[PDB]
């Protein structure tokens, strides 16, 4: 039985001021570097334990002993995402009900049905880059956000955000980003009801109304469509829980739409941004991925079957999720008194945070070269220890969108590598912006067309 270390404290504020930074996940990774596989982190009236080793996280992933917890970040996001799938407790009726109703929207048959609309948006991205002038550059995270928002809008809801028709972010995005930054900034506040934050609260409520106004319009656009969609919104409005026999009610549907619009794009745009970053910093890897794209994508319009054959592009995306998992933590609570790693006794209700980027740097798993971008690490899933690689979370509360995100990202990165040579013209220094999620900031490249027709 060991006592766990704890980072520096600030009297009655305990560890809370360590979150007073624009890059709190990166700050917690540096604390994990110093303190090791487990540390205690306290705020007034609250306690959690940050896990960084596969040795402890494999036990935390035992669903008989630990369930999904709402982190403070998720409690703040619940102000607008309610009892949607991401911010519901496992024991809330609406979690298993929505899970049962929406899981078929991510079947192989559903993915084949989404493919053509993913191609619609991917082609808009390729055309945008084909149409840039000499020595114009690409704003990578900006364009990846245009693509991933438009893809979830069109595939999920038959709604066109038309993000490639805008030089400024879609108003949905401006409000969503400001809501997430507010949720992140609020983590450090000991006295959140201090009138000093009255303006923050006004702006937050304004951003929530902007997101609900867009949901209103999507629900209206479908009500009056009088056309046969069989998409995510079809299942939300018409699907029945095989268990309870009931459909989702209007309040829960609104929360699911907000949830899928945010979760269905923010993390995928980060993944694509980090993937292109690693490819231009690792030219040998880029060449191998581009050779696969050229050999497989033999038609002007990629097919579902062809994207499934981009195996190396799939490994590039897993290796980008290893180094910078874009949803960089998840939280667990102990269902009963238990002992972690034979050393750390926990009581029922005790909370854990899984620090995913630090898990993915465990030298006992990946070897000494852990900072190197090597997609070949993923050649054989059987050679990776259990729970070493957790970018989609765990168990029945794992990402419902995993195959959607990876199909989209594989299709898009395949078309990017088929159609362009990329240049890191600024020798970009990686700068990771935090909005709860992680994304490169200020990442720019030049794309020289290979002049291959669409
Ligand atoms: C939206 C998908 C990503 C969510 C990631 C959330 C993960 N946080 C994103 C920012 C930092 C990181 C995190 O460690 N947060 C803890 C912070 C906290 C711990 C103890 C007491 C008070 C507050 C939390 O929110 O509880
Ligand atoms: C439900 C909120 C959310 C926010 C960011 C990423 C994924 C999900």
XYZ file of C-alpha atoms and ligand atoms in Angstrom:
488
model
C 0.000 0.000 0.000
C 1.756 3.219 -1.315
C 0.946 6.948 -0.771
C 0.672 8.678 -4.179
C 2.514 11.905 -4.949
C 0.735 15.238 -5.441
C 1.837 18.388 -7.289
C 2.365 21.746 -5.578
C -0.581 23.246 -3.624
C -1.874 26.820 -3.133
C -3.342 26.754 0.426
C -7.183 26.533 0.436
C -7.179 26.405 -3.448
C -5.126 23.112 -3.237
C -4.034 22.213 -6.856
C -6.716 24.315 -8.695
C -4.288 27.113 -9.814
C -2.222 24.541 -11.809
C -5.222 24.670 -14.262
C -4.750 28.494 -14.630
C -3.064 28.082 -18.055
C -4.244 28.103 -21.715
C -2.673 24.545 -22.001
C -3.842 22.536 -18.971
C -3.571 19.009 -20.538
C 0.051 19.789 -21.552
C 0.635 21.118 -17.949
C -0.755 17.816 -16.517
C 1.517 15.797 -18.907
C 4.556 17.736 -17.502
C 3.357 16.933 -13.900
C 3.015 13.223 -14.915
C 6.618 13.368 -16.330
C 7.801 14.551 -12.846
C 5.539 12.460 -10.540
C 5.034 9.221 -12.582
C 2.135 6.839 -13.275
C -0.285 8.215 -10.611
C -0.763 11.531 -8.788
C -3.470 12.993 -6.539
C -5.031 16.304 -7.710
C -7.293 18.257 -5.269
C -9.625 21.267 -5.709
C -11.851 22.670 -2.904
C -14.373 19.860 -2.048
C -13.079 17.509 -4.853
C -10.300 14.893 -5.456
C -9.153 12.924 -8.517
C -6.173 10.734 -9.406
C -4.388 11.134 -12.777
C -3.279 7.790 -14.314
C -0.518 7.706 -16.957
C 0.687 4.025 -17.080
C -0.758 1.048 -18.972
C -0.121 -0.957 -15.723
C -2.847 1.041 -13.835
C -5.075 2.024 -16.790
C -5.641 -1.675 -17.795
C -7.276 -2.103 -14.312
C -9.215 1.214 -14.580
C -10.726 -0.200 -17.871
C -12.357 -3.114 -15.927
C -16.079 -2.169 -16.336
C -16.995 -4.472 -13.371
C -14.931 -2.134 -11.074
C -15.077 1.328 -12.785
C -17.768 3.247 -14.723
C -17.610 6.462 -16.759
C -17.498 9.592 -14.577
C -18.419 13.160 -15.645
C -15.205 15.196 -15.202
C -15.791 18.866 -14.199
C -15.269 19.658 -17.948
C -18.154 17.299 -18.896
C -20.403 18.702 -16.086
C -19.811 22.190 -17.636
C -20.478 20.930 -21.225
C -23.668 19.209 -19.912
C -25.065 22.783 -19.526
C -25.656 22.577 -23.357
C -25.215 18.818 -24.187
C -27.597 17.639 -21.390
C -28.186 13.851 -21.216
C -26.889 13.352 -24.767
C -24.690 10.265 -25.210
C -21.357 11.991 -24.287
C -22.530 13.769 -21.075
C -25.027 11.180 -19.657
C -24.238 8.831 -16.742
C -24.354 5.119 -17.713
C -27.247 4.648 -15.192
C -29.459 7.435 -16.698
C -32.305 5.781 -18.677
C -31.521 8.058 -21.701
C -27.915 6.685 -22.026
C -28.760 2.995 -22.872
C -31.986 4.101 -24.700
C -30.111 6.528 -27.056
C -27.207 4.001 -27.386
C -29.635 1.245 -28.526
C -31.483 3.668 -30.923
C -28.358 5.281 -32.482
C -25.889 2.315 -32.677
C -27.494 1.129 -36.006
C -26.651 4.603 -37.510
C -22.977 3.363 -37.310
C -23.487 -0.141 -38.870
C -21.399 -1.217 -41.931
C -24.627 -0.695 -44.007
C -25.004 2.864 -42.554
C -21.297 3.647 -43.304
C -21.734 2.520 -46.951
C -24.729 4.939 -47.083
C -22.665 7.879 -45.667
C -19.726 7.325 -48.073
C -21.124 9.369 -51.057
C -21.834 12.440 -48.815
C -18.309 12.165 -47.254
C -16.961 12.207 -50.862
C -19.119 15.330 -51.627
C -17.315 17.312 -48.853
C -13.809 15.780 -49.538
C -14.132 16.863 -53.205
C -15.002 20.428 -52.018
C -11.732 20.402 -49.965
C -9.627 19.100 -52.911
C -11.202 21.705 -55.292
C -10.512 24.527 -52.785
C -6.792 23.561 -52.706
C -6.657 22.999 -56.530
C -7.941 26.619 -56.917
C -5.317 28.384 -54.705
C -2.830 30.671 -56.525
C 0.998 30.325 -56.576
C 2.479 30.433 -53.037
C -0.920 30.867 -51.346
C -0.935 28.530 -48.314
C -3.466 26.313 -46.532
C -4.682 27.052 -42.984
C -4.773 23.363 -42.033
C -6.931 23.197 -38.843
C -9.307 25.848 -40.311
C -9.877 23.756 -43.501
C -10.067 20.443 -41.549
C -12.821 22.048 -39.345
C -14.714 23.158 -42.521
C -14.519 19.553 -43.811
C -15.435 17.680 -40.595
C -18.307 20.034 -39.630
C -19.749 19.794 -43.172
C -19.360 15.973 -43.155
C -21.290 15.417 -39.880
C -23.901 18.022 -41.006
C -24.519 16.327 -44.383
C -24.119 12.619 -43.383
C -25.868 13.016 -40.004
C -28.616 15.555 -40.724
C -28.799 16.171 -44.524
C -27.873 19.815 -43.678
C -25.230 21.852 -45.592
C -23.144 24.153 -43.361
C -21.447 25.254 -46.653
C -18.242 25.929 -44.649
C -16.125 26.115 -47.898
C -18.329 29.110 -48.966
C -17.128 31.066 -45.841
C -13.780 32.876 -45.124
C -14.899 33.223 -41.437
C -15.971 30.309 -39.180
C -19.663 29.278 -39.382
C -21.413 31.104 -36.451
C -22.109 27.634 -34.898
C -18.283 27.120 -34.716
C -17.527 30.613 -33.214
C -20.140 29.957 -30.453
C -19.081 26.286 -29.913
C -15.373 27.243 -29.607
C -16.199 30.091 -27.161
C -18.439 27.680 -25.107
C -15.609 25.098 -24.894
C -12.989 27.790 -24.011
C -15.402 29.046 -21.282
C -15.848 25.456 -19.945
C -12.025 25.018 -19.898
C -11.373 28.466 -18.294
C -14.109 27.787 -15.643
C -12.170 24.641 -14.403
C -9.672 26.930 -12.543
C -12.362 29.157 -10.828
C -12.606 28.603 -7.006
C -15.569 31.103 -6.790
C -17.500 30.630 -10.102
C -20.494 32.719 -8.783
C -18.267 35.835 -8.204
C -19.934 38.730 -10.159
C -16.540 39.162 -12.002
C -17.788 36.220 -14.226
C -21.304 37.728 -14.908
C -20.099 38.684 -18.466
C -18.643 35.139 -18.976
C -22.082 33.685 -17.983
C -23.980 36.096 -20.339
C -21.626 35.176 -23.273
C -22.003 31.431 -22.406
C -25.855 31.611 -22.475
C -25.594 33.576 -25.809
C -23.322 30.841 -27.328
C -25.803 28.125 -26.120
C -28.728 29.946 -27.825
C -26.675 30.229 -31.102
C -26.128 26.399 -31.003
C -29.860 25.739 -30.144
C -30.996 28.120 -32.978
C -29.005 25.935 -35.474
C -30.543 22.710 -33.973
C -34.023 24.364 -34.354
C -33.295 24.930 -38.119
C -32.000 21.318 -38.699
C -35.146 19.887 -36.983
C -37.391 22.307 -39.048
C -35.502 21.478 -42.378
C -36.219 17.716 -41.735
C -39.885 18.134 -40.461
C -40.899 19.871 -43.744
C -38.389 18.071 -46.108
C -40.985 15.454 -47.248
C -38.039 13.341 -48.583
C -36.721 9.879 -47.517
C -33.456 10.243 -45.526
C -32.221 7.125 -43.615
C -29.525 8.969 -41.574
C -28.658 9.706 -37.902
C -31.528 12.276 -37.616
C -33.988 9.656 -39.061
C -33.025 7.243 -36.210
C -33.295 10.054 -33.551
C -36.853 11.025 -34.756
C -38.228 7.516 -35.665
C -36.007 4.832 -34.010
C -37.390 2.802 -31.072
C -35.336 1.255 -28.217
C -35.705 -2.551 -28.726
C -35.591 -2.791 -24.829
C -38.072 -0.056 -23.580
C -39.980 0.050 -26.976
C -39.873 3.908 -26.603
C -38.445 6.571 -28.982
C -36.253 9.504 -27.780
C -38.276 12.574 -26.628
C -37.779 16.044 -28.226
C -35.587 17.378 -25.313
C -33.131 14.415 -25.608
C -33.077 14.627 -29.483
C -31.992 18.350 -29.221
C -29.123 17.286 -26.875
C -28.058 14.436 -29.266
C -27.936 16.848 -32.267
C -25.726 19.345 -30.322
C -23.578 16.402 -29.084
C -23.047 14.796 -32.541
C -22.361 18.212 -34.213
C -19.623 19.023 -31.614
C -18.214 15.472 -30.998
C -18.815 14.488 -34.637
C -16.316 17.096 -35.971
C -14.052 18.803 -33.321
C -11.920 15.683 -32.633
C -11.809 14.502 -36.310
C -10.529 17.978 -37.423
C -7.763 17.691 -34.762
C -6.864 14.174 -35.959
C -6.570 15.236 -39.613
C -4.514 18.361 -38.601
C -2.101 16.290 -36.443
C -1.910 13.548 -39.160
C -0.867 16.078 -41.859
C 1.584 17.681 -39.345
C 3.286 14.302 -38.692
C 3.297 13.446 -42.456
C 5.106 16.712 -43.464
C 7.562 16.284 -40.492
C 8.218 12.603 -41.559
C 8.759 12.620 -45.360
C 9.542 8.832 -45.510
C 6.104 8.158 -43.919
C 4.378 10.655 -46.309
C 5.966 8.863 -49.358
C 4.674 5.432 -48.152
C 1.117 6.779 -47.494
C 1.111 8.624 -50.893
C 2.233 5.399 -52.710
C -0.699 3.527 -51.080
C -3.143 6.345 -52.022
C -1.892 6.276 -55.674
C -2.102 2.424 -55.914
C -5.590 2.086 -54.271
C -7.503 5.259 -55.335
C -7.533 4.423 -59.095
C -10.936 6.162 -59.777
C -11.703 9.922 -59.788
C -14.348 9.247 -57.024
C -13.087 6.931 -54.202
C -15.412 3.994 -53.322
C -16.197 2.596 -49.831
C -14.279 -0.618 -50.774
C -11.165 1.426 -51.799
C -11.062 3.401 -48.509
C -11.158 0.035 -46.622
C -7.933 -0.908 -48.564
C -6.003 2.239 -47.371
C -4.446 0.107 -44.564
C -1.251 2.238 -44.195
C -3.281 5.509 -44.100
C -5.271 3.829 -41.270
C -1.973 3.159 -39.371
C -0.889 6.832 -39.937
C -4.185 7.950 -38.302
C -3.735 5.541 -35.333
C -0.113 6.821 -34.804
C -1.352 10.483 -34.846
C -4.015 9.444 -32.218
C -1.229 7.780 -30.192
C 0.871 10.979 -29.925
C -2.013 13.545 -29.757
C -5.370 11.942 -28.925
C -7.708 14.889 -29.637
C -10.153 14.041 -26.766
C -7.218 13.791 -24.382
C -8.779 12.428 -21.169
C -11.702 10.483 -19.778
C -12.846 10.066 -16.196
C -13.864 6.994 -14.190
C -15.321 6.344 -10.705
C -14.907 3.233 -8.512
C -18.198 1.228 -8.419
C -17.036 -0.408 -5.124
C -14.009 -0.322 -2.777
C -11.062 -1.750 -4.769
C -7.233 -1.705 -4.932
C -5.445 -0.356 -8.032
C -2.134 -2.065 -9.028
C -1.987 -3.896 -5.643
C -0.788 -0.534 -4.155
C -3.540 2.168 -4.259
C -6.704 1.498 -2.219
C -9.809 3.276 -3.570
C -13.198 3.704 -1.898
C -16.533 3.452 -3.723
C -17.092 6.731 -5.640
C -13.376 7.670 -5.878
C -12.551 9.348 -9.223
C -9.758 8.712 -11.762
C -8.650 10.716 -14.801
C -6.993 8.785 -17.654
C -4.355 11.103 -19.176
C -4.402 9.558 -22.670
C -1.378 11.355 -24.253
C 0.775 10.237 -21.279
C -0.595 6.617 -21.446
C 0.460 6.648 -25.148
C 4.059 7.597 -24.126
C 4.490 4.611 -21.710
C 8.060 3.407 -22.600
C 7.293 -0.065 -21.061
C 4.755 -0.520 -23.936
C 6.100 1.397 -26.974
C 9.889 1.257 -26.340
C 12.395 4.103 -25.940
C 11.448 5.673 -29.383
C 8.005 6.762 -27.984
C 8.183 10.341 -29.437
C 8.917 8.982 -32.997
C 6.103 8.895 -35.618
C 6.123 5.217 -36.725
C 2.755 3.965 -38.107
C 4.253 0.419 -38.386
C 3.679 0.155 -34.549
C 0.073 -0.731 -35.521
C 0.904 -3.594 -38.015
C -0.394 -6.231 -35.542
C -3.085 -5.379 -32.921
C -2.270 -8.707 -31.138
C 1.285 -7.370 -30.396
C -0.151 -4.335 -28.474
C -0.858 -5.000 -24.749
C -4.477 -4.619 -23.530
C -5.599 -1.004 -22.903
C -2.282 0.476 -24.160
C -4.100 2.550 -26.828
C -7.274 4.344 -25.688
C -7.987 7.352 -27.998
C -11.727 6.353 -28.190
C -12.172 5.689 -24.451
C -13.314 2.373 -22.975
C -15.940 -0.349 -23.007
C -19.675 0.356 -23.492
C -18.853 4.136 -23.061
C -16.300 4.065 -25.934
C -16.706 6.450 -28.885
C -19.842 5.482 -30.924
C -18.319 7.535 -33.817
C -14.969 5.678 -34.082
C -15.583 3.942 -37.467
C -17.335 7.099 -38.856
C -14.363 9.331 -37.893
C -11.741 6.872 -39.186
C -13.593 6.248 -42.513
C -13.892 10.046 -43.057
C -10.247 10.743 -42.074
C -8.938 7.789 -44.168
C -10.982 8.937 -47.259
C -9.848 12.593 -46.900
C -6.147 11.936 -46.154
C -6.126 9.378 -49.048
C -7.527 12.004 -51.483
C -5.117 14.669 -50.115
C -2.105 12.362 -50.698
C -3.425 11.284 -54.182
C -3.963 14.879 -55.430
C -1.118 17.012 -53.877
C 2.517 17.163 -52.799
C 2.771 19.001 -49.421
C 5.456 21.475 -48.283
C 6.114 22.570 -44.665
C 7.128 25.974 -46.116
C 7.392 27.766 -42.670
C 9.175 24.882 -40.812
C 6.127 25.066 -38.484
C 6.764 24.759 -34.683
C 3.929 22.619 -33.198
C 1.670 24.817 -30.976
C -1.242 22.822 -29.456
C -4.358 24.874 -28.685
C -6.608 23.482 -25.933
C -10.426 23.795 -25.918
C -10.842 20.652 -23.740
C -9.988 18.987 -27.150
C -6.501 19.417 -28.767
C -5.660 20.878 -32.200
C -2.538 22.405 -33.802
C -2.779 26.224 -33.968
C -1.265 28.224 -36.864
C -0.307 25.058 -38.807
C 0.085 26.113 -42.497
C 1.423 24.192 -45.559
C 1.626 24.669 -49.334
C -0.062 22.020 -51.542
C 1.327 21.657 -55.115
C -1.315 19.925 -57.333
C -0.337 16.619 -59.041
C -2.970 17.698 -61.659
C -5.031 14.452 -61.308
C -8.652 15.010 -62.445
C -11.721 14.538 -60.175
C -14.777 17.090 -24.482
C -13.822 15.909 -24.607
C -12.560 16.124 -23.789
C -12.824 16.269 -22.292
C -11.469 16.276 -21.593
C -11.524 16.760 -20.156
C -10.119 16.887 -19.604
N -9.768 18.255 -19.126
C -9.484 19.204 -20.171
C -8.742 20.307 -19.432
C -7.866 19.559 -18.411
C -8.506 18.172 -18.358
C -8.788 17.727 -16.962
O -7.940 17.085 -16.359
N -9.964 18.093 -16.448
C -10.341 17.897 -15.061
C -9.761 19.089 -14.292
C -10.097 19.117 -12.817
C -9.582 18.127 -12.000
C -9.860 18.113 -10.631
C -10.634 19.113 -10.070
C -11.146 20.114 -10.884
C -10.885 20.126 -12.261
C -11.851 17.869 -14.999
O -12.489 18.446 -15.928
O -12.427 17.309 -14.045
C -20.226 16.609 -25.953
C -19.228 17.440 -26.027
C -17.956 17.246 -26.744
C -17.042 18.291 -26.873
C -15.854 18.116 -27.559
C -15.553 16.894 -28.115
C -16.437 15.847 -27.999
C -17.634 16.021 -27.324
